[PDB]
Write a structure and sequence with these properties.
- The protein has 263 residues and is α+β, with helices and mostly antiparallel strands.
- It has a single domain, classed as Creatinase/methionine aminopeptidase superfamily (Creatine Amidinohydrolase), CATH 3.90.230.10.
- Helix content is 25%, strand content 25%.
- The chain contains four helices and 16 strands.
- Strands 1, 2, 4 and 5 form a four-stranded antiparallel sheet that branches.
- The radius of gyration is 17 Å and the shape is globular.
- Bound molecules: cobalt (II) ion (2 copies).
- The site of one cobalt (II) ion has 5 residues, from loops.
- It catalyses: Release of N-terminal amino acids, preferentially methionine, from peptides and arylamides.
Length: 263
């Protein structure tokens, strides 16, 4: 069931979008060498809850134990903040945040580099981000959701990299994961012509090598099959009459918040 958000809904989202972005803006300083994914997890929850007056949708979601996800290096997804995993150097972590305020979610994620980059590190990240912005621009009404995934795909492989098919982006709003499914790859299955008011996520997961993954014992931690690196960046967006509106834009984003295709 694809939901077309009301204007008000939209105002709500803008809010969740921002709070969510804020948590990532807030944590920036704390992300340094010698940190516990666990602690990081504490600081966020306090913030989301204390200061923010909001809740985290990750918590208990399908039994998820933590408040947010934190995926180090070759961990792909759902990495679980342990009070004992500490931050190296050349560590490239993703923190995926997802927050609920007034019924609506704001879902976003980004990569952080630790205590002096790797090269391969910085490359991937950089590329992952571009592949995301890249889709960001395509977003406009009347476009098939399908040329978007292909696009990311093209870009990414072209760097000798691989796109992950197991996971994908999703509609979002009052429901954490709504319709549709947003695939970061080409597929005949795909066939959605976008409309204003539809809201959803772009969350490309990019491995430096091969598109194959493994799931751990703990039932969450997803790592590369290869043990290659993997990056992801994500944003929550709304389709406008002429392009899109990023509801999770942060200060460090090098893309406008409003993307218009008119004139
Ligand atoms: Co997310
Ligand atoms: Co998401």
């Amino acid at each position: 069931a694809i939901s077309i958000k009301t204007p008000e809904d939209i105002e709500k989202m803008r809010v969740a979008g921002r709070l969510a972005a804020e948590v990532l803006e807030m944590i920036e300083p704390y992300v340094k060498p010698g940190v516990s994914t666990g602690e990081l997890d504490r600081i966020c929850n306090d913030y989301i809850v204390n200061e923010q007056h909001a809740v985290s949708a990750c918590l208990g979601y399908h039994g998820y134990p933590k408040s947010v996800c934190i995926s180090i290096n070759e961990v792909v997804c759902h990495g679980i903040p342990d009070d004992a995993k500490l931050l190296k150097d050349g560590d490239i972590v993703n923190i995926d945040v997802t927050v609920i305020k007034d019924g609506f979610h704001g879902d976003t994620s980004k990569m952080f580099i630790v205590g002096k980059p790797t090269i391969m590190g910085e490359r991937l990240c950089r590329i992952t981000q571009e592949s995301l912005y890249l889709a960001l621009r395509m977003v406009k009404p009347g476009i098939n959701l399908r040329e978007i995934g292909a696009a990311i795909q093209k870009f990414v492989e072209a760097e000798g990299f691989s796109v992950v098919r197991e996971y994908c982006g999703h509609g979002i709003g009052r429901g954490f994961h709504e319709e549709p499914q947003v695939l970061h790859y080409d597929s005949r299955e795909t066939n959605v012509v976008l409309k204003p008011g539809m809201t959803f996520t772009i969350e490309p997961m990019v491995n430096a090598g091969k598109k194959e993954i493994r799931t751990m014992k703990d039932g969450w931690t997803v790592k590369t099959k290869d043990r290659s690196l993997s990056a992801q960046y994500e944003h929550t967006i709304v389709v406008t009459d002429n392009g899109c509106e990023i509801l999770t834009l942060r200060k460090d984003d090098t893309i406008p918040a409003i993307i218009s295709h008119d004139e």
